[PDB]
Design an enzyme around this catalytic site. Structure first.
Site, PDB file in Angstrom:
ATOM      1  N   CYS B 152       0.735  -0.752   0.129  1.00 12.07           N
ATOM      2  CA  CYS B 152       0.113   0.258   0.047  1.00 12.07           C
ATOM      3  C   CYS B 152       1.141   1.305   0.079  1.00 12.07           C
ATOM      4  CB  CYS B 152      -0.945  -0.033   0.909  1.00 12.07           C
ATOM      5  SG  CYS B 152      -0.442  -0.251   2.766  1.00 12.07           S
ATOM      6  N   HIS B 179      -0.092   6.024   9.709  1.00 14.16           N
ATOM      7  CA  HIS B 179      -0.325   5.435   8.687  1.00 14.16           C
ATOM      8  C   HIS B 179      -1.600   4.735   9.530  1.00 14.16           C
ATOM      9  CE1 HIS B 179      -0.806   1.101   7.082  1.00 14.16           C
ATOM     10  NE2 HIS B 179      -0.452   2.135   6.631  1.00 14.16           N
TER      11      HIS B 179
END
Ligand SMILES: NC(=O)c1ccc[n+]([C@@H]2O[C@H](COP(=O)([O-])OP(=O)(O)OC[C@H]3O[C@@H](n4cnc5c(N)ncnc54)[C@H](O)[C@@H]3O)[C@@H](O)[C@H]2O)c1
Ligand SMILES: NC(=O)c1ccc[n+]([C@@H]2O[C@H](COP(=O)([O-])OP(=O)(O)OC[C@H]3O[C@@H](n4cnc5c(N)ncnc54)[C@H](O)[C@@H]3O)[C@@H](O)[C@H]2O)c1
Lengths: 339, 335, 336, 340
Positions: B152, B179
Site C-alpha cells: 500500500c 499511517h
C-alpha cells in the site's frame, strides 16, 4: 513459619497477569517466582515496564538470561504452550494464577497440578459451576484452604456482586436485568477479521464500534450470592475505551424504596472492595482504582408508576485494575489459609 | 473478454478486492478460497467498519455465496494444488493470504487444473517483478507467471517519487508515512507474535513508530531511484486512511508552484491531484492509488540550497485494492 | 519570599501549571480567572482524563475553592483589563486562555489594579522574549513585562536542534510534528471559530494537517538557527502526547552513533534521552520538555551527501507545562 | 403553494442536521432547498457540505458563488441574518423552514420566521415546548391537520424510542419502563476536558476518551408522541467514543406475558419506512447513514421470567445523525403538503 511467603506462578503474563504481578509487589505474604507465556523475556519485561493504560512500572525492570529482574529480584520466564509441561515445582511455586484465557475450567486448570507442577490454581475468570467462585469481601468466607482450583470470577461479577448483595440484604431482590457498558478487551479484533471463537461481533474493529456481546456475570451470580440464584440476567455493550467499565442494574425489589434510601444502603455497605461516590465522574476517573466496584449515587433511579417500582443502580469498575485488586486480595487470603 | 479472477485469502485485501471488482465491468470473481468458516466470511463481506455496508446482497449457500443473486464458489483448501481454479474459468489469482509470497510458493496455483498467472499482495522476492499500476506496469511482457502488486505505501509513494524524478531529478530523500493502525498491531498491550515491541502496544490508543520497506525498495518500481530513498512510519489511531510525506533533495531548483504543476500534469486514474484542505476521513474508500495534496507542498531555500516536501494521501485499504484490481486486469489481458 | 501568581484561563495548561505549582516553593497561585464557576473549575482540577486524579484535597467555597488547605479566588471576567489582580497581591500572570497571546493583548493585565508581569503560555510574537527553559532562559534579566514560554513543539524541538547546531552545525531542516489533538479542534465537523478548514473537522477521528510556527520561529530561542528551519504538523487521534521529527542537513558528516551520543551528552532536566522503543502513552505526564528517542535516528548517505533524521517525544501538555513552570519559577526569582 | 408544485424548503442553521437534511433533499422527488441562512462564512459552510467525516463526501459538486452556492448546477441562496424577522423566506418561494439552530426552539421564537415576507410553517429540530405538536414520522404524524404553524420533529433519541415503545404498547401494553441509550459523542461535549458552557460537569469531559453518563429527556417526554405512555418511561444515556451511531435499550414491564419470539414478531409486523427490523448481529458502524428512524435488533431481545413475573428488554439502533435527519425530511415534506 516466622515469615511465610507463598510462591506464586503466573500463566499468561497478559493484562491481568501483569497487573497482578504489579500489585503483588506490595503484598508481603506472596511473591511471584515464575512466569509462563508464549514469548521471550524481552517482550514480557518491556510490557511490564511500559503500560498504555496503567502507567510506567513502579521500579526497575531489567532483562536477564531466561527471565528478568524486578527491583533486583530475578523472575524466571518460560514459554510452554501446554500447562502440563510447566515445571512449576522447580521454582517452588505452590499456587498458579491461570490468566491465559485458555484454561478456565476445573479440568483444564488442574493440568497445572502434578508432581512437578503446582498445588493449587486460581483461575482469573469464571471457571464453571463446579469450582468455588469468589468475589473478595462478598463471599471469600466460602474458602477453607483445601480447594485445588478456585475462580476469581469475572470483572463484571466483582462489580455487580456487592451492589446486588446490598440490594438483597436491605430490600430483597425479586429479579433484575443488567447491562455493562464495557471497555474493549484483547479478545476483540483490532480491525474487522475472523474471530477465532466464531463471535461475529467480536470479529469487528473493537476501538471503532459499539459492540453488543453476551456476558455470564448476572446469570451465574448464584455462585457468589446463592439467594440471587436465577434472579438476574444481563448483557454487555463493548465500547471504544481501552479500559474502564460501568454496570447498570434494573431490578424489582420486595420493598418500596426511595433514591435516598438506596444510596444510603450502598454507602453503609462500603469497604475496601466496594466504594461509594457522589461526584459526577466518567470512566477515565476509575482507571487504576483499587475498589472492585465503585457505586455512583448520581446515577440512581427509583421509578414509581401506579405503585410499582423499578430501581436502577450503577457502579463503575476498572475491568483491569478493579478486578486485579480483587483477584490479589483473594490470592493473598487463599494463600494464608491454604492447606 | 471478461477477466475471471480467483481470490486466495479473504482478509481485508481479498474482501475489498472482491467489492471493488463488482464495480469494474469486465472483471469478475468466480472463486474465493479461504480456510475460515464461510458464515464468518459472508458476515465480514456484508458489514465493514470502515468501508461501509456491502453494495448489494450476500447469502451463504451450500458450496459458496449467493452475491447479488449469483452463485460464487467458496472453497477452503490449504494447498493451492487442490484448488481447481480452471473449473470456474479463473485465469489469474490474487494471492492475498501472506503464506505464498514467493515465486515458487505462488506458482503452486499454476497447475493442471489451476490458474495461468498470479498477483501476490506483498513483496514477492528477487524473481518476482513488482508492479505499481500506472507507474511501471509497462515492464510486463505477459510471459511472467507471478508478479507482485507491491505494498500500500509503495503504491502511494511511487507516482509522487516518479514525478519528482521525471521532472527534476531526485538526489536523495526520506519518507514518513503517518499511517492507520492495522491488523498486525495488538488491540491492547500484549505479546506480539512477530517480536515487535511497538506493534505489541495498543494500536488505537498510541502513536506507534514502526519500520517500513517501501522507500528502501523503491528501486524495484523506479530503478532510477535505487538506493536513494529511506523511510519510516508513525502508526496512529485511525482504522484506515494514511498519508506519506517525502522530503527530498533534487537536481534542479524548483518553486512550490512548479512542483504542484508537475504533480497535476502527472495525474491519472492511479494518481489524483487536489488543492482542497482535506483530512484522512475524506480519502477512505477512494480508488486512486495515491492522492497528491498541493496544500502541503514546501520548498525551503536556505543559502541557495533546497529541501522539497511533497505529500500524498492514500487509503491503505481501498487505494491499494484499486491498484491491485487494475494490475489484475492488465496482466491477465497481456497474455 | 513567595511570589504570588494569577492564572488567566484555567484550561489544560492553566490547570496543569496549577498542579505543578503546588510543588514549587517560590510561587503560589492566589487568583484564577476563567469564564465559568468555581464548581466547574474545582471538578476539572480534581478529575483529569489524561493526567489523572489530583494529588491532594479540593473543596468548593464561596467565590473560589480550597486546595490542600488554601483558598484561591476564582473570578469570571472575559476582558483582561477588568481583572483586579492586585486585590489578591498577584505579581505575575500566566496568560493561558489562547485569546491574548500578543504583547499588546497580554499587557492589558498590567495596570494599577492589575499585575506587574505576564508569561504568555504560547508563542507571543516577535517583540517578546521567548524562553525554552534550559535552552535560553539566561536571556531573562527580570525587568521584562511580558515574556513567552513558546509552544509545546518549540520546547521539544529546541534542545534537539541546539545539540545538532553545537556539535555539527545545521545548514537547514524541515520538521513534522505528529501531535495530539487539542481543544482548538472541533469534536465533530463544524465551523471553526478561527476559520481553519482543517481544525473544523472531527479531531479524534482524523489525521489533520495543520500549520505550526515552531520551526520558523526557532530563531527567537536559538538565534544562530534563525531562518534555517521550517515545518508543519499532523494532528492525530490521541488526547495528549506528541512527537517531533526533524530532517536536516549538517555542516559535517556524522554517524547514527555520533548523533545519538551528542544527544545523550546534552541530556538534563529538560532534555531526556531514551533507547527504549516507547510509544506515545509512555510519555504522558513526563516532566522533560523533550525526550530524544535514539531508536528513531537515521543518517542517510547517498553519493556522499547526508540527510539526518532526529526524533523527540513530548507530552504537549505536561512537558510544556513543566518547562513553563521552570521558566515562571526562574523569572519570579530574578524579577525586578 | 408554489405553482410548480415543488415543496420549497428553507434551512435556518447549517450544522450537522441542516447539512444532512440538505443532502437528503437532493434525492427527494418534488422537494428542494431554496434558501440557507447561517451566520458562518459561506466558504466554511461549503467546505463542510463537501467533506463530512462520518457521512462521506457530498454526492456531486459544491461551488461558492456570489450570494450562495451552486450545488449540482443549481443555485441556492445563502444568507447570514441573526434575526428570523429579517429573513425574507418568501422571496425564494420558501413555504416551510427547518429551524435547526437551537436558538428558536419555542412557538413564539420559531414564529418569527412567519411574517409578511417570511415562511408559512416551521419544523423545529428539537423539543419545542408544548403549544407545539411533537411529531415522530410514521408514529404520530396523523396528529397534524395542516393548520399548525410551528411543529417539533422531536429528538434523535425520541425518533428511535417511539416506534419501539409504540409497538410494545399496541401489542402487549406497557406498565412502566427504563431506557438507556448508549450514544455517540456529540458537538455539545468537549473535545478535551474543559469548562462546559451549559454547566454540565460530565459534558465538560473529553468526549472521545470516556464513557460519559448523561441525562436525556426522550423517555420522560414520550407522552407528547404516545400519550398513553405519559409518565410511564424514564431514562438516561451513556455517551461513548464513536462519532455517530447509537443504540437504545428499553427494559419494561408489560400488561401480559410474552415470549422472545412474540416480541420479535410484533416488531417485525410494525416495520415500515421509519422502523426497520434486523436479525443480523451488527455493530454501530453498520447503521451509519441509514434512513430508518429506528432499527430494531431482534438479536438483543430478552424476556426474563422469575417467579412468574417478567422483565422485557428490547433494543433498537439509530444513526443519531442520519436516522433523525431522515425523519425530519419526511415530516417536512408531509407537513408542507397538508398545509397547502
Ligand atoms: N482484561 C480484562 O478486563 C479482564 C478482566 C477480568 C478477567 N479477565 C480474564 O483474564 C484472562 C486473561 O485476560 P487478559 O485480558 O489479561 O488477556 P491477554 O490476551 O492480555 O493475556 C493473555 C496472556 O496469555 C498468553 N497466552 C495465551 N495462550 C497461552 C498459553 N497456552 N500458555 C501460556 N500463555 C498463553 C498470551 O500470550 C497473553 O500474554 C481471561 O480469562 C479474561 O477473561 C480479563
Ligand atoms: N498542548 C496544549 O494544549 C498546549 C501546549 C502548549 C501551549 N498551549 C497554548 O496554551 C494556551 C491554552 O491552551 P489550552 O489547550 O489549555 O486551551 P483550553 O481551551 O483548555 O483552556 C483555555 C481556557 O481559557 C478559558 N477562557 C477562554 N477565554 C477566556 C477569557 N476571555 N477570559 C478568561 N478565560 C478564558 C477557557 O474557558 C479555558 O478554560 C493556548 O495559547 C495554547 O496554544 C497549549
Amino acid at each position: 513459619s516466622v515469615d511465610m511467603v507463598v510462591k506464586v506462578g503466573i500463566n499468561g503474563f497478559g493484562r491481568i497477569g501483569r497487573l497482578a504481578f504489579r500489585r503483588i509487589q506490595n503484598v508481603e505474604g506472596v511473591e511471584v517466582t515464575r512466569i509462563n507465556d508464549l514469548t521471550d523475556p524481552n517482550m514480557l519485561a518491556h510490557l511490564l515496564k511500559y503500560d498504555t493504560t496503567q502507567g510506567r512500572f513502579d521500579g526497575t525492570v531489567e532483562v536477564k538470561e531466561g527471565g528478568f529482574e524486578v527491583n533486583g529480584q530475578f523472575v524466571k520466564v518460560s514459554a510452554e504452550r501446554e500447562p502440563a509441561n510447566i515445571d512449576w515445582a522447580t521454582d517452588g511455586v505452590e499456587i498458579v494464577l491461570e490468566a491465559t484465557g485458555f484454561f478456565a475450567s476445573k479440568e483444564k486448570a488442574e493440568q497445572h497440578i502434578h508432581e512437578n507442577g503446582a498445588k493449587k490454581v486460581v483461575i482469573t475468570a469464571p471457571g464453571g459451576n463446579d469450582v468455588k467462585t469468589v468475589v473478595f469481601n462478598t463471599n471469600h468466607d466460602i474458602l477453607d484452604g483445601t480447594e485445588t482450583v478456585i475462580s476469581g470470577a469475572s470483572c463484571t461479577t466483582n462489580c455487580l456482586a456487592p451492589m446486588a448483595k446490598a440490594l438483597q440484604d436491605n430490600f430483597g431482590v425479586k429479579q433484575g436485568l443488567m447491562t455493562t457498558i464495557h471497555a474493549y478487551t484483547g479478545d476483540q479484533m483490532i480491525l474487522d477479521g475472523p474471530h477465532r471463537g466464531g463471535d461475529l461481533r467480536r470479529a469487528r474493529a473493537g476501538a471503532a464500534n459499539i459492540v453488543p456481546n453476551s456476558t455470564g456475570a448476572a446469570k451465574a451470580i448464584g455462585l457468589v450470592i446463592p439467594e440471587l440464584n436465577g434472579k438476574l440476567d444481563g448483557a454487555a455493550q463493548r465500547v471504544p475505551v481501552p479500559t474502564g467499565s460501568v454496570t447498570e442494574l434494573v431490578a424489582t425489589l420486595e420493598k418500596d424504596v426511595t433514591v435516598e434510601e438506596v444510596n444510603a444502603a450502598m454507602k453503609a455497605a462500603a469497604n475496601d472492595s466496594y466504594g461509594y461516590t457522589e461526584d459526577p465522574i466518567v470512566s477515565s476517573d476509575i482507571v487504576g482504582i483499587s475498589y472492585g466496584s465503585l457505586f455512583d449515587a448520581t446515577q440512581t433511579k427509583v421509578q414509581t408508576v401506579d405503585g410499582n417500582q423499578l430501581v436502577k443502580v450503577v457502579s463503575w469498575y476498572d475491568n483491569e485494575m478493579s478486578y486485579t485488586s480483587q483477584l490479589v486480595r483473594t490470592l493473598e487470603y487463599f494463600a494464608k489459609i491454604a492447606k
